[PDB]
Amino acid sequence: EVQLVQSGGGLVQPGGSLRLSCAASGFTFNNYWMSWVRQAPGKGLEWVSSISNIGGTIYYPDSVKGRFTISRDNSKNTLYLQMNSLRAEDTAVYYCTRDLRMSDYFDYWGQGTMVTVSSASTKGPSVFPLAPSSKSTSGGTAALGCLVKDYFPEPVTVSWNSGALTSGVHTFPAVLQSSGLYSLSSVVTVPSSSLGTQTYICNVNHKPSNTKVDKKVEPK
């Protein structure tokens, strides 16, 4: 069967360089155009580069022109992508493809190689209360929570009242911000009649920075 075996990639800082490789079996290289297509996390497919059977013709989109170089070694049945002057927006899974040029489609896809471009380093979170108020209450149930802002790397764990409060707790998956730092939130729904009688503390643990925060969440 056709195989497209990818390697390379990894983590670099902005301005850095990486080389991707795609070794092929099951067809003769010099008979096919080959391409790279990438996909940023949660986003769509984006074509990166294409090269003809022989290397006589190369195409790039403007998004990578002057920074990325596609090449191939037909005697080794191997395709390369040299990525220079990398930036955070280049973070993506990169797929090697075999093309059928005369039919304008990609007929086989590699399993992908992850490339991460980031200057972020270990940083503990800034934890803020999300206080219950009349504006966060619906028909007798109040929502309260805590915001865990601007930490790196994952993960963070959140408990409430040292694990004694579990019913109604919802800790949301983190967002990766364009700053390169993560944020997440944890919310719990409780009876509004409990706001004057119960204490609510969110327990945040960010082991990568050796930080714990116990944040009291007081009603407004």
Binding site: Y95, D107, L147, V175, L184
Partner: protein, 214 residues
């Protein structure tokens, strides 16, 4: 240098038929071959249609492709829907040294009742404002299918910077959650009358508002 536009998401029950459209902005859809790719969650894409309506070997005839020039669109139709068909689908066309993809359509094969999102919007905390920062927090939960889009407004004007939104993620009850954050300065927060987080799910919206004057 055209665009291909697809719906954000579609859904149907097992055994039914669903269609995903792909509309070309400029030029004629029939001028260039359209192909379609299936991408299951956490997986690499595979081809399901090429040359407008041809199936690769190993792709069943439940998948079909068509072209409608009157609407300048291509369509992927999947009959006899099975759970394995749940995936994102992408259309593709080439022209003049450029390879264009549609934005992708999430296909859900319905395995439970649909549910509209619950939306809770929190204003910046006093602590964050006193630290010279401000974040609005829009928490979106309990929706199915797992596809939403999120837009923010400052007073009545769409916000185009400072927004961070997650992909939907499956909850332990098999519905979906997402969150969106709006970054403001404290002066920005205080100088507007209201902010809104607008969540679109299946073509209908749930919008929550918060006000600095509380």
């Amino acid at each position: 240098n055209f665009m291909l536009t697809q719906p954000h998401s579609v859904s149907e029950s097992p055994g039914k038929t669903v269609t995903i459209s792909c509309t070309r902005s400029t030029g004629n859809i029939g001028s260039n071959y359209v192909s379609w790719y299936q991408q299951r969650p956490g997986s690499s894409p595979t081809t399901v249609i090429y040359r407008d309506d041809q199936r690769p070997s190993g792709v069943p005839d439940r998948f079909s492709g068509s072209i409608d020039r009157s609407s300048n669109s291509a369509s992927l139709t999947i009959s006899g829907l099975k759970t394995e068909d749940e995936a994102d689908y992408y259309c593709h066309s080439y022209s003049t040294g450029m390879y264009i993809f549609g934005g992708g359509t999430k296909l859900t094969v319905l395995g439970q009742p649909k549910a509209a999102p619950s939306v809770t919007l929190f204003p910046p905390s006093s602590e964050e404002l006193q630290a010279n920062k401000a974040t609005l927090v829009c928490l979106i939960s309990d929706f199915y299918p797992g596809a939403v889009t999120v837009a923010w407004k400052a007073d009545s004007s769409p916000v185009k910077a400072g927004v961070e939104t997650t992909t939907p993620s499956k909850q332990s009850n098999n519905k979906y959650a997402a969150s969106s954050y709006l970054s403001l300065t404290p002066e920005q927060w205080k100088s507007h009358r209201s902010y809104s987080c607008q969540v679109t799910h299946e073509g209908s919206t749930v919008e929550k508002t918060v006000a600095p004057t509380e």
